[PDB]
Amino acid sequence: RYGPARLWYDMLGVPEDDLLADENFLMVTQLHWEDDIIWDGEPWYSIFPIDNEDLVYGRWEDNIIWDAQAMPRLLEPPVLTLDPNDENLIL
Amino acid sequence: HELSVEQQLYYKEITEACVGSCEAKRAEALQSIATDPGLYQMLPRFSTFISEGVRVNVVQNNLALLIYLMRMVKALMDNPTLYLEKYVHELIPAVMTCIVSRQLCLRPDVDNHWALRDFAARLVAQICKHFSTTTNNIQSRITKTFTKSWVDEKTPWTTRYGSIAGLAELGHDVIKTLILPRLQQEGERIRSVLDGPVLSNIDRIGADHVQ
Amino acid sequence: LPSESMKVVAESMGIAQIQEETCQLLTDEVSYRIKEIAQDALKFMHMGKRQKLTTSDIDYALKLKNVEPLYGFHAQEFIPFRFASGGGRELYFYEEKEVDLSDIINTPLPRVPLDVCLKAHWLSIEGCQPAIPENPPRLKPRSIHELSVEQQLYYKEITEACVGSCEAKRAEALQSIATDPGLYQMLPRFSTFISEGVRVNVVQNNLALLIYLMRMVKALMDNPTLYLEKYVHELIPAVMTCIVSRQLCLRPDVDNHWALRDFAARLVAQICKHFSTTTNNIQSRITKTFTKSWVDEKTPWTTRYGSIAGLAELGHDVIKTLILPRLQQEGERIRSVLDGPVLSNIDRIGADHVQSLLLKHCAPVLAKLRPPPDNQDAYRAEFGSLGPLLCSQVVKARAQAALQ
């Protein structure tokens, strides 16, 4: 309740504490990549940064709210997790 | 971890400037969000604020505060210094909620939910132009949600409007291979427009907006 | 077996007027002997461990029941042919039932296959099955990359070998790309390295960097294990770029490699047409871009020559339906380059290459649909570009056909 989004919590007043085939959607069949072709243009550590595991792996699609009234999964308040993999954060 | 008092005060002033007391402070707050160099360490707070505020639309169907939150997202995207790759999984379903939800209005007939539709559709086309990678599969997973919301019957004319708006803002080949097969659906639309059992209902304005 | 087949056999032998009970008596006796042998030929199939029931199993099942696996002929004296089999009769239902006796002599005999050898490999290493080609295969925690450090070191060695400092290193690295079974789950990083490379490698037209990357694409494609059409949306642009772009370096000489690079790009386009094909997405999209490259006003010789090659290597019908209504434009372009008072440019070289390629394609396009009559001056109705030399190319093609 007192963390980031406390303003929203206080405003609420809560106080505890075949066209669906996979290929159709591959971006080779949905992108004008012909425009990209450049006509007349004028290991101690990984060299690729560790990607966000949640974006790469998690099903964030399950936090989309398709219908406000009939929402299939009961959602819960989210705690701040301060990922330390990201640089630019002191801790 | 905890915000220092400087950035705690900056977060408070910037979030309360985009709630609707006056327009000029809102424009200066959005021009702050779009053009400051050091707003990292306050990006998770802004993402949480935006996603929870779009969720709070279900308790109070406020069109105006949703337009303000979508202009907050559009200002967050224009910042060159901050990278929204780690927080895009929160901002995608908020803009999606502003697109494909059915009641975006308090008075459904007079509120132009229609613009928060094409504005958020342009926003999600930008969010899957800048961030879609083959490891992400952002654009394919957004097209699949829009497609199975459009092809499936029983969907309201507002959410079909949102689906068609997003799919048509994605580009030309998408409307070639998604919209053009179901052009016969226009006949099913004109079933309820040129005739229409009930005339004084709210289906007609949404149907000819879709048209 | 049906009894109406047993009366046909009886009356075609001299035994006429057989009763139905006489005829039913034949078809339960012989249907038992077929069932007795096929149950007995399944013993040789289970003991020869092939679950196949080959043609030789019935030869041993017959010999086991003291019947000659003699098929089609029966020797009442047994002395000429004993229980050794003759391998059956190679006969069909849809056969011709009459052949010429010199047709069987003049056909080439099939190749005797390789003899049996003993190779060893590893089903399991201390419990784990290796992925060799002989086998079927609050702070959030600090995440690990999805590649191992042996895999990441392998990627670094293969990419630093594929930029072609040494040729033997390249060739192995290309074969390693062509047959590594575990090269999936590293394929995003290879596709990104290719795509990103060509785009910052055409900023300065570095031909080797590009010829090595195109060979890397070709080595990525013929690998049978990996799934490529998730990554072809990055591949297509780079391979097509190796065809429709201007050359920032010395264009006139290495243009020979440049022409070769364009041919490689055309081959990549042909591969794109061949695999990964669904309705109206890939082949028609690159065909439309090639045609609007061609109909483009004042098309560059570099871009013009590359697009000409790309549309040329698309197969049999594509040049049959597309290159036809455009000969006059090609001739006019050649005439303008010729009338130039200046060769201090690459226009003349581009024109000569384009004309030669177009003339060779037109030659078989003609050899293919029409007789070789009036090969002297009838081609003057098509502006007289290749004429008698085109006729000579058609004659060489006819000689190759005769050799075949």
Which residue from C400, C402, C397 is spatially nearest to C363, judged by alpha carbons?
A: C397
CA distances B18 to A64, A69, B22, B71, B74, Å, are: 23, 26, 9, 9, 13
Q: Work out the minimum CA distance from A35 to partner chain B, whole angstroms.
A: 13
Half-sphere exposure of C118 (CA within 13 A, CB side): 0
Helix H, strand E, coil C: the string for C5-61 is HHHHHHHCCCCCCCCHHHHHHHHHHHHHHHHHHHHHHHHHHHHCCCCCCCCCHHHHH
d(CA B17, CA B29): 6
d(CA B15, CA B13): 6
Residues of A in contact with B141 (CB under 8 A): 61
For testing contact with chain A, the best of B86, B154, B185 (most A CBs within 10 A): B86
| Sole residue written with tokens 């030789």 | C56
Q: Does C191 touch chain B (CB under 8 A)?
A: yes
Q: Work out the minimum CA distance from B140 to partner chain C, whole angstroms.
A: 11
CA dihedral over C262, C263, C264, C266, signed as positive or negative: positive
Please report, as a single letter, which amino acid is at residue B24.
A
Helical ranges in C137-278 per DSSP H: 149-161, 167-179, 187-200, 207-221, 232-244, 255-274
**CATH number, domain at C13?**
1.10.20.10
Residues, chain A = 91
Which residue from C331, C312, C328, C308 is spatially nearest to C320, judged by alpha carbons?
A: C312
Helix (H, G, I), strand (E, B) or coil at B194: coil
Q: Does C231 touch chain B (CB under 8 A)?
A: yes
What is the CB neighbour count within 10 angstroms for residue A12?
13
Please report, as a single letter, which amino acid is at residue C99.
V
Mark yes or no for CB contact A40/C303 under 8 Å.
yes
Q: Which two tokens stand for residue C210?
A: 């590009």
CA distances B203 to A61, B161, C323, Å, are: 29, 12, 54
Q: Is residue A78 within 8 Å of residue A9, measured between CB atoms?
A: no
Q: Which two tokens stand for residue C302?
A: 């570099």
What is the CB neighbour count within 10 angstroms for residue C369?
8
Which residue from B91, C63, C174, B169 is spatially nearest to A63, judged by alpha carbons?
A: B91
What is the CB neighbour count within 10 angstroms for residue A10?
12
Helix or strand holding residue A70 (H, E): none
Mark yes or no for CB contact A38/C286 under 8 Å.
no
**Which range of residues forms the domain containing residue C43?**
3-65
What is the CB neighbour count within 10 angstroms for residue C327?
15
Residue C73: exposed, middle, or buried by beta-carbon count in 10 A (0-12, 13-18, 19+)?
exposed
In sequence order, the 6+-apart residues with CB closer than 8 A to the CB of B24 are none
CA distances C385 to B176, B201, C332, C396, Å, are: 41, 72, 11, 18
Nearest residue in C to B174, CA atom: C281
CA distances B175 to A30, B28, B159, B167, C236, Å, are: 9, 37, 17, 7, 22
| Sole residue written with tokens 């971890």 | B1
Which residue from C200, C201, C151 is spatially nearest to C180, judged by alpha carbons?
A: C151
Phi, psi of C125 (to 5 degrees): -115, 105
Mark yes or no for CB contact A85/C236 under 8 Å.
no
Helices C207-221 & C255-274 angle (0-180, nearest 10): 20
d(CA B98, CA B50): 12
